[model samples]
Target chain A: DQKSRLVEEKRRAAKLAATLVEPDQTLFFDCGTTTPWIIEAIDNEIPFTAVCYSLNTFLALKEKPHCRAFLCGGEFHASNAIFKPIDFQQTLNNFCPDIAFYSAAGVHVSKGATCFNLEELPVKHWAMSMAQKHVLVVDHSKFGKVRPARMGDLKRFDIVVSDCCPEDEYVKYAQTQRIKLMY
Target chain B: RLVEEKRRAAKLAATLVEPDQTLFFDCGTTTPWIIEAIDNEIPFTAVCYSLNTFLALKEKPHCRAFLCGGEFHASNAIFKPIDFQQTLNNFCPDIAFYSAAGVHVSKGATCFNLEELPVKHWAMSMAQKHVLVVDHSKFGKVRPARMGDLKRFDIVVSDCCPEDEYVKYAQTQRIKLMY
Candidate 1:
């Protein structure tokens, strides 16, 4: 039963990734472990526009041949495998994305979503503010954990995509916060 | 005379850099020589907007380089017209090393490209000391866009000093000339 629960979570995460994309939509993809799943599931013929900071995600999206990708310029931090903001506002200020897909280090009912690294906070916050819709992608592991630097509140998110249906407390909290929970 | 003049001017410009001073290097052809003249081990903060200057400064030891955020212009290989007023207000560099297309005693410093004027003006304004670096060929020539008056610069550095008329005028205006 224990192993089955983990496998089911992976399936739901993949499903959530696939459901997010639509034809000709402009999307912002943030860097995280689950993001590769989303990138892999993106359709090759969709002809969408992608604005991302992850070198890995940018490389993966380039394989599709139909996606127009714009990577923000900044100082490269090897440990985090993401570019730290030196001046990302220049490009981001000009282009507004349709949907922003991001993952948090921790997610909670009250504390909202948080990230461990402070350097990336500017880029992530800007991405959230610039998008029409903000979606958080996570598995069951991130449900109750809290990290430093609050990105935003859970109430602010349009949708939360998780692997399995959460407990009754979380269900009630989502309902109260008006967040759409997708399993 | 032109080549030797630029070499001497560049050499003198390098000597003016003090250890641990924050510097603003404006984007120009001659700015690279000023960078190259900086001692390899000197620790200083470099705030620049040019891709070329960032790459060069990154290679030097003990240099903390900050590249201003802006749209990259491919033709000039520099990030320009960056909305840097707020950032500059926060940084407030100690010294600014600048270059321009034309330098006139009356019309001040000018640039050929209008797009770059705003960024250059900001760098000049934020720096505590403004040093203008130009080749001798730029003397007496005025470009279309005027950035500021030549008198505003703290020191004028050139490959060779201009004729006596311009030198007397600079003295009258209390502008220090370095060649």
Candidate 2:
């Protein structure tokens, strides 16, 4: 029963994430289970350039012939199934995306968004800085959770898209922080 | 004629691989053959960008392969403009097995693609010893992009090798010409 709830939450979160994508916008799609759903949600006719690090994400984007996709080459991390950060900064130096959608292992009001792996942190940080708009995509399960490495504050995100509305405390915090929260 | 000569040159080049050496395999048509020639059980660390070379090296249990991080050029199946200058700054490769599109006395070793020049240049500079693998077809040919001088290469492995002029030139310049 709990598994079904999580699955439904992920579906809603992914749907909301897809709404944020604009045609002709250059986007950086962070690798995760939900991000592929977001990729599928993107309109077939929408012309956009996508930058990704995951081999799965690359293949998914490749399925859409119209989408211009670039994969950041680096050391292959078998555990995460994504290319770990190395000299990928040189490629990032050339590209600046309009929007960046990233999924975190944990998110907190004060502690900020966090992830488990250290190698991918630098690339994620670089992508966030290069993007004009930063969007955090998470399900209800990740709320108030904190991980080892902090990516940045909740304040850093321009918008947050989640499956269900958070508790009143987080809602109030989002209101005060001026973070556009969508359910 | 060209195929037989390249095969002979590639065979001789492959025999030069030794165990427990850090190698820099330059991206070229001949490099895949050289990589295959190395014993699978011989432990070596290889730094390369050719997709073919990487795949071959990955299959060998004893080969510790390091692929350069860069944009993948699908047309040629090579990673290029790889930022090896920073990654390889501390890495001192024991030998660099290199190939080029053209070989000339005055113009140096050249390649057709300009984007691959930086990667080749970095490998040649970082390796302690540089070995050039080429066939007779490239003897007098000169491509557009000049990577470095032929003088930088310690040894040249080729089939139907240099005639009297190049032999004398190689002797004078202290570059070994091998078939």
Candidate 3:
């Protein structure tokens, strides 16, 4: 358990490292609590392009150097920290990112991925569709939890970097499906 | 048979009201004229069932009217019974009026459909007094379901109330003459 915790801690660090690259690599920092931490890890002054609907993420990126940022507008969905319907879909159509990351309430191997609110589905789908590689930055406690609505199919993501390696059979099944279960 | 039936039915309706009492008119084809016929401004509340009647009642300042309809009904501009029930529950009035497609005097007041009957009855029951609005065409006519007792309503409004035996039956029931 201690080793897993350490692995999770290092995984976040590695994820942060991956986010700090050059301006040519566009990043979409999804709306979530952990996103601010990831955004904080990036060198704000390095002039990388970023797109976000999260007001917090936009504020975090505002002062960072070499960062070009766009904020999507639409029906404000406060439950999951994103705008839905109009602005959410419009923003996705206009911008494509090299990497996209989001936070989810739960990840079920059978149900795929889920969040507490249904409106987040459209935003999550837009993020996944526009990104070259998708990452879900969730903690160990998120596994096996069930939320109201599932947002994505399990096989769509290139990688799932979690805070711990899951011993749960469904998680193992997820791993066998070539979902590079990074920790 | 239809012409004579309509004539007697209309006459029977006209004989059932007291001229000066506050009258309530439920929006319908048969009852709209009752609202229109009263010569002076009768202090009344005309609860319009449809958007058209609501607008018609808008010009009559003496006639307090409420347009009760479901939100989606705006497309067709007709209110459903749910809207009518909810509106009536919010405001209970002095005298409520309604029209029916048929009145099986032995059964009760009947309408073309039952969807509007429950709410129609609710509005009728809330009125301290009740009146029926029947046209010349609907007397002795049979409809699928009945609403309430003919004895419950104090008056009826029509132009051709018959002198037939059923008219005597109504008079015995204490439904006052209105023509």
Candidate 4:
């Protein structure tokens, strides 16, 4: 509840994102506040394969009786509670995900997805590259604001699941790009 | 109530552990209680496969742990690595602690997870001493997977006095039974 005001919106977006998943499919969850919400919303009675790095995300999935989770271990980054595992790319190469739910610092129309740190770029790129369908999960608060420039754009994601897209420009951009805008 | 029993056995097991020993805790719910009972100031080498148990060990500054990373099963949160047997064969911990879902005089100490059988046996065979940490509820029940018979363990730690049959058997086997 770091952002007490946006907690409802973030959870609303996360619950919608869980609807995209199906049983027996592999999923990659990026490190973010909404990650645990999405994971908790999933039906745990069925089976699925999950790969994640954030300790909080891992903790969330641990309670699911049928979910098989693989944790990427290394030096734990306290700021984000994410792990920068040695040979992350090499380990990630083993997984061919059906869907990758990735989050960003900010979403943009022109510059695409803006991230907090350069270290986060490769992982953000991999989440898009290694999955059959890439999803961008963000809240209304992150719209139009770019932390800086350049990750992937509306075209890169098959769907953008958010509480609501505040700015008409991004909705217009998504419409032109044919990216399914979901709330 | 189960957690209470587990802690009873765990606290007793913790007292017997000497400083600077190499210890192996099986993939069981009992281990975390044992970890809580163990003194953090006295350093030890710990090996485990379960993520929750590892999370407990991470808090102990003096404990250096080796994780057997493999496919995670959320049903019980145990890892069944491909090479776990080879790793345990090489490790030969000084004292290895095991848990049983069933403890029978004839059927031996059995476990719920069949995946742990080989790893348990391998660790037990290598270790200089084997200790069974369990509560009275597990007694007389027969589970499918067998770690070994009562004869295999050097000590058996339980929450309360074991059944008369087990007590008679322990005396015959010369196994140290701690209540």
Interface RMSD of each: 4.8, 3.8, 18.6, 5.7
After superposition, the stretches of candidate 3 with alpha carbons farther than 4 Å from their true spots are A1-22, A85-90, A168-171, B1-179
- Which candidate should be chosen as best, given TM-score against the real structure? 2
Candidate 4: segments with Cα more than 4 A from true spot: A40-48, A62-94, A106-129, A143-158, A166-183, B1-5, B16-23, B43-47, B51-55, B58-95, B104-106, B115-129, B136-141, B149-155, B158-179
Q: Rate the local accuracy (lDDT) of all candidates.
A: 0.75, 0.79, 0.61, 0.79
Worst 10 residues of 4 chain B by lDDT: B81-90
Better of 2 and 4 by TM-score: 2
Reference-based TM-score, model 3: 0.45
Tell me the TM-score for chain B of model 1: 0.91
Q: Which window of ten consecutive residues has the lowest lDDT sum in model 1 chain B?
A: B80-89
TM-score of each: 0.63, 0.73, 0.45, 0.68
The Cα error of candidate 2 at residue A102, in Å, is: 1.7
**Which 10 residues in a row give candidate 3 chain A its minimum summed lDDT?**
A83-92
Q: Fraction of true inter-chain Cα contacts (below 8 Å) kept per model?
A: 0.10, 0.23, 0.00, 0.15
Residue B130 displacement in candidate 3 (angstroms): 56
CAPRI-wise, candidate 4 is incorrect
Model 1 clash tally, residue pairs: 1
* The 10-residue segment with the lowest total lDDT in model 4 chain A: A84-93
Chain A, candidate 2, TM-score of 0.93
Ranking by lDDT: 4, 2, 1, 3
- DockQ: which is higher, 2 or 3? 2
Docking class of 1: incorrect
Number of the candidate with higher lDDT, 1 or 4: 4
